[PDB]
Design an enzyme around this catalytic site. Structure first.
Site, PDB file in Angstrom:
ATOM      1  N   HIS A   6       0.753  -1.252   0.000  1.00 12.48           N
ATOM      2  CA  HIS A   6       0.000   0.000   0.000  1.00 12.48           C
ATOM      3  C   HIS A   6       0.778   1.294   0.000  1.00 12.48           C
ATOM      4  O   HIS A   6       0.192   2.340  -0.292  1.00 12.48           O
ATOM      5  CB  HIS A   6      -0.984   0.036   1.210  1.00 12.48           C
ATOM      6  CG  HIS A   6      -2.008  -1.089   1.253  1.00 12.48           C
ATOM      7  ND1 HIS A   6      -2.988  -1.294   0.378  1.00 12.48           N
ATOM      8  CD2 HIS A   6      -2.055  -2.088   2.203  1.00 12.48           C
ATOM      9  CE1 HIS A   6      -3.625  -2.367   0.781  1.00 12.48           C
ATOM     10  NE2 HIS A   6      -3.067  -2.832   1.860  1.00 12.48           N
TER      11      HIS A   6
ATOM     12  N   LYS B 199      -5.510  -9.559  -8.185  1.00  4.65           N
ATOM     13  CA  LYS B 199      -6.099  -9.136  -6.929  1.00  4.65           C
ATOM     14  C   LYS B 199      -7.258  -8.216  -7.296  1.00  4.65           C
ATOM     15  O   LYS B 199      -7.017  -7.318  -8.091  1.00  4.65           O
ATOM     16  CB  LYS B 199      -5.047  -8.383  -6.116  1.00  4.65           C
ATOM     17  CG  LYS B 199      -5.556  -8.075  -4.717  1.00  4.65           C
ATOM     18  CD  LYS B 199      -4.566  -7.343  -3.813  1.00  4.65           C
ATOM     19  CE  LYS B 199      -5.177  -7.236  -2.410  1.00  4.65           C
ATOM     20  NZ  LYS B 199      -4.425  -6.344  -1.545  1.00  4.65           N
TER      21      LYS B 199
ATOM     22  N   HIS C 161      -3.350  -3.289   8.277  1.00  3.55           N
ATOM     23  CA  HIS C 161      -4.407  -3.516   7.296  1.00  3.55           C
ATOM     24  C   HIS C 161      -5.000  -2.198   6.881  1.00  3.55           C
ATOM     25  O   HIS C 161      -4.986  -1.267   7.696  1.00  3.55           O
ATOM     26  CB  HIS C 161      -5.523  -4.416   7.862  1.00  3.55           C
ATOM     27  CG  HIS C 161      -5.038  -5.854   7.698  1.00  3.55           C
ATOM     28  ND1 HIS C 161      -4.760  -6.440   6.542  1.00  3.55           N
ATOM     29  CD2 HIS C 161      -4.693  -6.745   8.699  1.00  3.55           C
ATOM     30  CE1 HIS C 161      -4.247  -7.615   6.776  1.00  3.55           C
ATOM     31  NE2 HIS C 161      -4.215  -7.800   8.082  1.00  3.55           N
ATOM     32  N   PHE C 162      -5.446  -2.074   5.635  1.00  2.00           N
ATOM     33  CA  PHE C 162      -6.039  -0.861   5.125  1.00  2.00           C
ATOM     34  C   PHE C 162      -7.528  -1.172   5.210  1.00  2.00           C
ATOM     35  O   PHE C 162      -8.044  -2.011   4.476  1.00  2.00           O
ATOM     36  CB  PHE C 162      -5.558  -0.632   3.673  1.00  2.00           C
ATOM     37  CG  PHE C 162      -5.969   0.718   3.103  1.00  2.00           C
ATOM     38  CD1 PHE C 162      -7.240   0.899   2.554  1.00  2.00           C
ATOM     39  CD2 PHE C 162      -5.082   1.782   3.181  1.00  2.00           C
ATOM     40  CE1 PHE C 162      -7.634   2.141   2.076  1.00  2.00           C
ATOM     41  CE2 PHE C 162      -5.486   3.014   2.707  1.00  2.00           C
ATOM     42  CZ  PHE C 162      -6.749   3.197   2.157  1.00  2.00           C
ATOM     43  N   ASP C 163      -8.269  -0.544   6.111  1.00  5.94           N
ATOM     44  CA  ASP C 163      -9.672  -0.841   6.293  1.00  5.94           C
ATOM     45  C   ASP C 163     -10.552  -0.111   5.282  1.00  5.94           C
ATOM     46  O   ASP C 163     -11.500  -0.713   4.785  1.00  5.94           O
ATOM     47  CB  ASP C 163     -10.081  -0.467   7.723  1.00  5.94           C
ATOM     48  CG  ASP C 163     -11.333  -1.179   8.206  1.00  5.94           C
ATOM     49  OD1 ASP C 163     -11.286  -2.391   8.438  1.00  5.94           O
ATOM     50  OD2 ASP C 163     -12.357  -0.518   8.354  1.00  5.94           O
TER      51      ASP C 163
END
Length: 116
Positions: A12, A33, A111-113
């Site tokens: 990211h 992805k 984590h990228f929420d």
């Protein structure tokens, strides 16, 4: 091997573009992805979000944090036509608040929420 913090950075951080970067960062060398977000800010400014506004994650857990400011992000979304090996992405640039889940000591994004 890769920690969760290292995987977040490779997937990211970036301190058509989506097709190139998804391949370079090893997201699409062995699968396509469906969606991924890249953040165009310094790593330390994204790590700083883990002490900003605490919010619930989508899953209901509470180790999520929302940035006070918007940040430059590129959203990459697979087209309805994409098929491995030929992954294809639509690139959307935007300035949005990011929400990340944080863990560890040091307390860092793992984590990228979401973006909002």
């Amino acid at each position: 091997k890769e920690t969760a913090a290292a995987k977040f950075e490779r997937q990211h951080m970036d301190s058509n573009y989506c097709n190139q970067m998804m391949k370079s960062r090893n997201l699409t060398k062995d699968r396509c992805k469906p969606v991924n977000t890249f953040v165009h800010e310094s790593l330390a400014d994204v790590q700083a979000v883990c002490s900003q506004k605490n919010v619930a994650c989508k899953n209901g857990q509470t180790n999520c944090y929302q940035s006070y400011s918007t940040m430059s992000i590129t959203d990459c979304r697979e087209t309805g036509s994409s098929k491995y090996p030929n992954c294809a992405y639509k690139t959307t640039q935007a300035n949005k608040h990011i929400i990340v889940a944080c863990e560890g000591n040091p307390y860092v994004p793992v984590h990228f929420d979401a973006s909002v």
